[PDB]
Amino acid sequence: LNPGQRIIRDMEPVSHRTNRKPFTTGQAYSKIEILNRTANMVIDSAAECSYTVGDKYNIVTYANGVKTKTLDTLLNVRPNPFMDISTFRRLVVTDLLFEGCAYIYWDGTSLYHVPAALMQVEADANKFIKKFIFNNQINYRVDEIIFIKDNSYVCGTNSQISGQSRVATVIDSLEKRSKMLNFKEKFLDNGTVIGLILETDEILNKKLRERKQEELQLDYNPSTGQSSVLILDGGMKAKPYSQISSFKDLDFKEDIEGFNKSICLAFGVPQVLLDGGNNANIRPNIELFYYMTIIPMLNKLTSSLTFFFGYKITPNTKEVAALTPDKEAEAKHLTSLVNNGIITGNEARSELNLEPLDDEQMNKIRI
Amino acid sequence: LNPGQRIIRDMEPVSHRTNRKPFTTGQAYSKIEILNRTANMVIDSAAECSYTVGDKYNIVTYANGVKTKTLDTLLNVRPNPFMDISTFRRLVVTDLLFEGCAYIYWDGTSLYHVPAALMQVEADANKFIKKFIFNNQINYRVDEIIFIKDNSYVCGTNSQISGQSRVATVIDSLEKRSKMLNFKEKFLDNGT
Amino acid sequence: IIPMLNKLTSSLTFFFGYKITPNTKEVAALTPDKEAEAKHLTSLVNNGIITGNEARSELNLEPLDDEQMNKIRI
Amino acid sequence: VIGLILETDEILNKKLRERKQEELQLDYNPSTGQSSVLILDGGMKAKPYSQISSFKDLDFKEDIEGFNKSICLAFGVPQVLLDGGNNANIRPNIELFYYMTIIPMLNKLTSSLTFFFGYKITPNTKEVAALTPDKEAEAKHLTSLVNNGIITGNEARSELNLEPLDDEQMNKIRI
Amino acid sequence: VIGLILETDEILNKKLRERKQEELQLDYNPSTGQSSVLILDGGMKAKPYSQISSFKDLDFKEDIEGFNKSICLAFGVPQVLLDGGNNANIRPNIELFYYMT
C-alpha cells in the first residue's frame, strides 16, 4: 500500500461541491437558449452512443460472477427493470456535465442511478476511499457504487475526489450578456424623441398652448396631414436642438457575439454545427465534435466500468446517423480489402452492420 | 432495489410544469412567422419518419402478448380505430416539443394519446413511480402509459421526472424583437 | 430529429420488449444520389459481399423469388 | 443617459417641476406617447447638450482576442480546433496538436519508465478516434504493399487493428 | 469618466449638493431608473464638456504583433506552427522548422 495515503486523506478528507450556484444554473438553463441548445446537444450526443463488452481481464474485481450477456443487456437494452436506457444514459451524462462527478449504484442484478447533487465521497486513511454518503443516513459502502470523476484543480491541490463542472465556468458570461441586453431594451423603452421646439418669452395661455401642440403634431405628420410650411408670428422662435444620446453609440454586436463564442468554446460544440455551412464544413466538424469531445467523456465511464466488472468495455458508435460513412468510399475500400485477401467476406458484412451469412467461401480468404 | 429511493422521492415527490407562459406561447405561435415556420418544420420532419419492429428481447415487460404484426400496424398504419397515424405522431411530437414530457396511453389493443398539459407524475417511495394523475380523478396506474421525458435541470437538482421545454427558451427573444419592431413603426408614425 | 425520436423508440422498446429503431428510408428529402447508390450497390453485389435480394431491399423494391439472387455470386 | 435639458433662471415650484419632468418623459416617448412638438413659454430655454463619454471609445475586442490568442498559444492548442473550419484545415491541425503537444509530454514519461523498468516503452495511439486514418488511402497502401511483396497479410491485419488469422499463405510473402 | 457637469455661481449647501449628485446619478441610469428629462431652475447651467484622453489613441496591436513576430524570428519557429493553418501550411512548415532550425 501507499505509505503516505494518510497525508493525502488529511489534506482532503471529504469531497467538495463545485457547482456553486445551482439556482442560477437552473434559471439560465430554463431561460437562455444558447445554453439549452448546447447542453441538450451534448447530452443527446453522449446518450446516442452504445457500448460493447468484449474480452475478460484476469483480475480480481469488486463485482464478480457477471456474464457477458448480462452486461450487454444492462448497458445496451435496459439497465433497470423500471427505467429506460435512454433516460438512464441522459441522467448520468447530465449529472457528469452539470456536476463534476457522477455515480451509478450496483444492485444484485441491475444498475440503479444515484443523483450526484447529494453524494459526498469520504476518503480512507489506508487504501483509497472508505465510504459513500448519499446526503446522509444510507452510507452506501463502496462495492456497490461506480465512480466517475472529471479532472479538477480546486483551491491549491488537485483532488483525487470531487471534480470541476463545465457549466459553472459559463455562468458569468450569460450574466454579463443578459445585463447588456436588458440595458439595451430599457434604453429603447425609456428614450425620448423630439421633433420640433418653439420658444417664447411670454405666458401664452397654457390650455391653447397644449391645443396648438396637438394641432401642429397632427398636421405636420406626413402620414396623416398635408402641411409643410410654418409661419411663426408674435415673436415666437424655434430653437435648433440636437440629439444628446443616440442609439448608434450602443454597438453591442461584437460583445454579444464574443460571449456566444466563449460559451460554445466552453462546452466544446463547434460553431459550424450551430450555424451550418458547406459539406466540407459539415462532415469534418461533426466528426471532430463527436470524437474529440464526446468520446473522452464516455471513455471515463467505460474505464470505470472496466475496472468495476473486469471486462474490456469501449465506446462503439457504428450506428450513429450523423457518423454514417460515405457509401462509395466504404464500398471501395471494403471490396479492395476483401478481393486482395486481407479480410474475409464475413468481416466486411459485419462492418457493413449486416448479419454474417453461413456460407463456406465467405469464411476463407479468397487469395 | 435502490436503498435510497425514498430520499429521491422526498426531494421531488411530484412533477413540475416547465411551460411557465402558455398563453404567451400560443399568441407568439399564432402571430410570429419565424416561430410558426420552425415549429411546423420540426413537427412535420419528426412525423415523416416511420418505425420498424425487429427482434424480441427476452425480458419481462409491462405489456406482454403483443405480436410483431400488431405492433407494426399500430406504429405505422393506424394506432387508434378513430384517429390518424399522422395526427397521432404530430400530437405526440408537439406535446414533447412545447411541454417537457409526452404521454401515450396503452389500451387493450390500441394506443391512445393523452395530453401532457394536464398529467402530473407522482414518484414512488420504493421503485420508480406510483401513478399518473391526468389533471385529477382517473389515476391511470403506470402499466398503461408510455413515458417520454426530455433532459431537465430544474431549480438545483436534475429530476427523474418533469422535463424542460425548448419553446420557453424562445418566449424571451420574441418579446424583445417585437418591442423593437413596434417601436420603429410607432416612431415612424408619430414623426414630423 | 433522430435523438428526439430515439427517446420515444427507447421508451417503446422498454414498454413492449421489441427492438424498435427510427428508420426513414422513405423521406423524400433523404433520397440518396441515384448514381452513387447504384455504383456502390452494384460493386458490393458483383464482388460477392451482398446478395441481389439485399440490394433490391435497399432499393425499396420487393424481393424476387429467383435462385441465383439468394446465393453469393462469387 | 439624458434626453432633454431645460434651464430657467427662476425658482419654479420644485414639486410641479418634478411633475413636469415625469410628464414630459412619459409623453414624448414614442413607445408610450403621442407627442412630438414642444412649446416653451415664460422664458424657459433648452440647452443643446452633448455626450461626454460614449461607449464607442471602449474598443476592447482586439485586446481580448489577443489575450485569448496568447492563452491558446501558451497551452499549445491550434486555434482551428477551438473555432472549427474546413475539410482541409480540420485534420492536419488535429495531427499537429496531438503529435507536437501531447507526444513529447508522454515521451518524457515513457523515457522515465524505460529507465525505471528497462523495457522499451513508446507512446502508441493507434486507437484514438481523432487519429483514425483515411479508409481509402489506408486500404490502397496496405494492399499495394501486401501484393507487391514487402508486407505479409498478417502484418496488414495487425495494422488494421484486427486479429492475426492462423492461415498458411498469410505468413509467407506472396511474390 | 463623467456623464454630466452642472455649474452654478453660488454656494448651494454642500450636503444637499452631494445628495443631489447621488440622486441624479441613480435616477438617470437606464439600467436602474426611469427618467430622461431634466429641468434646471435657479440659474444652474450645464457645461458642454468633452473627453480629453480617450482609449482609441492607444493603438498597441501592431507594436505587440511586431514584438511577438520578432521573438518567433529570433528563435526560429514559423508563425504558422504557433497559429495553425491549412495542410499545405501545416506540413511544409513542420519540415522547414525541424530541418532548418
Author numbering:
A (entry chain E): 11 to 377
B (entry chain D): 11 to 202
C (entry chain D): 304 to 377
D (entry chain F): 203 to 377
E (entry chain G): 203 to 303
Article passage:
Bacteriophage T5, a representative member of the T5-like family of siphophages, serves as an excellent model for studying the assembly, infection, cell wall perforation, and DNA ejection mechanisms of this phage family. In this study, we used cryo-electron microscopy (cryo-EM) to determine the structures of mature T5 (a laboratory-adapted, fiberless T5 mutant) and urea-treated empty T5 (lacking the tip complex) at near-atomic resolutions. The T5 head comprises 775 copies of MCP gp8, arranged into 11 pentons and 120 hexons, forming an icosahedral shell with a triangle number (T) of 13.
Using the local reconstruction method, we then obtained the structures of the connector complex and the portal of mature T5 at resolutions of 4.8 and 3.2 Å, respectively. The adaptor is composed of 12 copies of p144, exhibiting structurally conserved conformation, as observed in many phages.
